[PDB]
Design a protein around this ligand. Structure first.
Ligand SMILES: *C(=O)/C=C\c1ccc(O)cc1
Length: 125
């Protein structure tokens, strides 16, 4: 494992160092998105929760194609405000139900340490 706790204060500094191999060692799901919603990285833990094959979702649009259940003011709306503002740090519960057994999760969205990239972290609740 990669020892990083969900919701740590400096999580973006810790994950700046990890390649896809390392992101697969996290105990929670991690998605890296550009400012458009396109998927840059998708770890193994997220695949275990949603059933998606990480390698097959890279390059798709998260809100339009892969996870349309998050295309709502409660998820996408917050993301788009964060991108626009250039700052984002929010945590909330959500239910993932597109093409899967409805699953309650905790979501943490936060701006990456890198210019136009944004993290989505997920864990079961
Ligand atoms: C609603 O969109 C649920 C499904 C889903 C699929 C993949 C990811 O990463 C999140 C949510």
């Amino acid at each position: 494992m990669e020892h990083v706790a969900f919701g740590s204060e400096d999580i973006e500094n810790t994950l700046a160092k990890m390649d896809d191999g390392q992101l697969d060692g996290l105990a929670f799901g991690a998605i890296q998105l550009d400012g458009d919603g396109n998927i840059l990285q998708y770890n193994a833990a997220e695949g275990d929760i949603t059933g998606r094959d990480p390698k097959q979702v890279i390059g798709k649009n998260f809100f339009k194609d892969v996870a349309p259940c998050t295309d709502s003011p409660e998820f996408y709306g917050k993301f788009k405000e964060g991108v626009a503002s250039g700052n984002l740090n929010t945590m909330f519960e959500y239910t993932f139900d597109y093409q899967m057994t409805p699953t309650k999760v905790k979501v943490h969205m936060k701006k990456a340490l890198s210019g136009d990239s944004y993290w989505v972290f997920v864990k079961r609740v």
